[PDB]
Amino acid sequence: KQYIISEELISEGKWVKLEKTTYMDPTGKTRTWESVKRTTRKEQTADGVAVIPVLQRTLHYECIVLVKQFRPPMGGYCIEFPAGLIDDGETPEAAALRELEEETGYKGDIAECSPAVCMDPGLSNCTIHIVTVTINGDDAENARPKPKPGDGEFVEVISLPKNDLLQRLDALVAEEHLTVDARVYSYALALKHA
Amino acid sequence: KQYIISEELISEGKWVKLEKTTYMDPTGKTRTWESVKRTTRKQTADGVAVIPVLQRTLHYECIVLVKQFRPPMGGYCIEFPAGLIDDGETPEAAALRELEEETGYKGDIAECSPAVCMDPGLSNCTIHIVTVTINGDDAENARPKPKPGDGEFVEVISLPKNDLLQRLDALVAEEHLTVDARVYSYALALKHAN
Ligand SMILES: O=C(c1ccco1)N1CCN(C(=O)C2CC2)CC1
Ligand SMILES: O=C(c1ccco1)N1CCN(C(=O)C2CC2)CC1
Ligand SMILES: [Cl-]
Ligand SMILES: [Mg+2]
Ligand SMILES: [Mg+2]
Ligand SMILES: [Mg+2]
Ligand SMILES: [Mg+2]
């Protein structure tokens, strides 16, 4: 029933733009929305990937590998799944493995890859693939792994046991001003609810 | 170690603005980011999203979701019920109110997250994730009455919690919908648990 009628540029940065979206409502009435989009999406299935990296290690409980970074939009430190934008021509899987290695040092193995999922659909068109990757922590590749952070990337790795993820996150947020990512929180919640 | 030095308005609409953020990287080098922000926040967070567990005896427990046209996405999305928190509303009351408006269900608060970030590489947007149970055997939830305010057009989709990920993948496959990243993240962890 509903569809886009027109999209008029309001302001274009180097990385992000704002648009006035006109669309048809199901009553048959024209309405508008203020939409955010990135400037960087070309032919990729989505803007980015986030990685759910399950660290598996003999006689260890499975950990979820997370990263902590300063996020200028937020004005503070955030705890998230490893993530980055998909390079032109890169597959979501390759991007996930590459970002995981750059951000954490770990060399993972693909498990599964979501369809493109929307980050904040009342606000932006931005999308990701959520890529589950296992990390064989018994492999010597993954023994004492060096993050290879790109220019201006400053990332800390935090591995937390899957079996206590939510309480461990709640305890980190108790100790300091940091914000947990909604996707990480959502996944830690489901782990409790299951 | 990292922090915001200053913010420059680039463009301000009625609902969203774009800012150029100057911040200090951990080396002592000054860098910029194109930060997006809502103009509506006053509150704990911009919004709430509701994880609504519909519990009926002798049925599978379901997670109640909503399907809506999202103009920034150019299409239909499947999401947790959600909306912005009104001035002087608590995140709990916002949750029960949005849930009622969008689904017609009346629920009870189980738990409520701290403020969590929506897309921290892009925006300062935050929500409270509020887990809510719905006693689907109560008379008030028998023939649920959804009260859309002006311009909301919301279809309700309940899905069994025990097969949530497979049910969502099916809808994407069949209906050309975009699943929300938080919904998908939750659905993933229900499978990944134990
Ligand atoms: O443009 C926006 C907006 C919000 C975030 C980004 O853009 N709005 C939201 C407020 N309104 C509504 O809720 C629509 C009538 C349903 C009107 C349009
Ligand atoms: O301004 C933005 C941006 C992207 C989305 C919203 O704003 N960027 C992104 C890429 N940046 C880097 O990766 C710097 C090396 C740290 C430079 C500026
Ligand atoms: Cl529950
Ligand atoms: Mg990243
Ligand atoms: Mg990166
Ligand atoms: Mg809503
Ligand atoms: Mg509503």
Structure tokens at A186: 């959502």
CA A143 to CA A136: how far, in whole Å? Answer: 10
Contact A120 B116 (CB under 8 A): no
A120 labelled ligand-binding: yes
Q: Which ligand is nearest to the CA of B61?
A: 3
- Separation between Cα atoms, residue A175 and residue B114, nearest integer Å: 14
Q: How many Cβ contacts (< 8 angstroms) between chains A and B? A: 230
Nearest to A93, CA basis, from A44, A66, A129, A135: A129
- Chain B residue numbers touching A74 (CB-CB < 8 A): 117, 120, 124
Closest listed residue to residue A10, CA positions, set B151, B36, B77: B36
Measuring CA to CA, which residue among B51, B46, B29, B71 is closest to residue B189? B51
* For chain A, domain boundaries: 1-194
CB count within 10 Å of CB A77 equals: 17
Nearest-ligand number for the alpha carbon of B66: 6
CA B132 centroid distance within chain: 13
Query: Known binder of ligand: residue A183?
Result: no
- CA A24 – CA A111 distance, rounded (Å): 40
- Looking at CA atoms only, how far is residue A74 from chain B in angstroms? 5
Overall resolution, Å: 1.6
B7 is in an annotated binding site: no
Q: Which ligand is nearest to the CA of B97?
A: 7
Distance CA A169, CA A189 (A): 11
CA distance B136 to B56: 5
Do the Cβ atoms of A132 and B15 come within 8 Å? no
Angle, in degrees to the nearest 10, between helices A182-193 and A165-175: 140
**How far is residue B1's CA from residue B23's CA, in Å, rounded to a whole number?**
11
CB A169 within 8 A of CB A79: yes
Q: Which atom of ligand 2 is nearest to the CA of A38?
A: 5
Distances B93 to A120, B112, B136 between C-alpha atoms, Å: 22, 11, 20
| Best CA proximity match to A111, nearest among A53, A173, A169, A189 | A53
CA-proximal residue: ligand 1, atom 14 (nearest): B151
What is the Cα–Cα distance from A124 to A37, expressed in whole angstroms?
6
User: Quick one: DSSP state of residue A74?
Assistant: G
Residue A46 in 3-state DSSP? coil
Which residue's C-alpha comes closest to atom 2 of ligand 1?
A33
CA dist list (Å): A145 to A67, A149, B4 = 14, 12, 31
Instruction: Return the residue whose CA atom lies nearest to atom 15 of ligand 1.
Output: B151
Instruction: Measure B147 CA to nearest chain A CA, in Å.
Output: 16
Query: Pocket around ligand 1: residues whose beta carbon is below 6 Å from it?
Result: A 31, 33-34, 122-123; B 15-16, 150-152
Phi, then psi, of A81 in degrees rounded to 5: -60, 145
Q: Which residues, 6+ apart, have CB-to-CB distance to A95 below 8 Å?
A: A48, A49, A84, A85, A86, A87, A131
Sign for the pseudo-dihedral over CA of B69, A74, A160, A165: negative
Q: Measured between CA atoms, how close is A12 to chain B, in angstroms?
A: 9
**Cβ-based contacts of A21 with chain B (< 8 Å):** 71-72
Helix B181-192 vs helix A182-193: crossing angle, to nearest 10: 40
Whether A112 has a binding-site annotation, put simply, is: no
Q: Regarding the domain with residue range A1-194, which homologous superfamily does it belong to in the CATH classification?
A: Nucleoside Triphosphate Pyrophosphohydrolase (3.90.79.10)
Q: How far is Cα of residue B182 from the mean position of the Cα atoms in its chain?
A: 7
Spacing, Cα B133 to ligand 3 middle (Å): 6
What's the token pair of residue A102? 């750059």
Are the Cβ atoms of B151 and A31 closer than 8 angstroms?
yes
| DSSP state string for chain B | --EEEEEEEEEE-SSEEEEEEEEE-TTS-EEEEEEEEES-----SSEEEEEEEEE-TTS--EEEEEEEEETTTTEEEEE--EEEPPTT--HHHHHHHHHHHHH----EEEEEPPPEES-TTTB--EEEEEEEEEETTSGGGTS------TT---EEEEEEGGGHHHHHHHHHHHH--EEBHHHHHHHHHHHH--
- Token pair recorded at residue A28: 């048959």
> Which runs of E-coded beta strand occur in chain A?
3-12, 16-24, 30-38, 48-56, 63-71, 76-80, 83-85, 108-113, 117-118, 127-136, 156-161, 179-181
Q: Which residues contact A29 (CB under 8 A, 6 or more apart)?
A: none
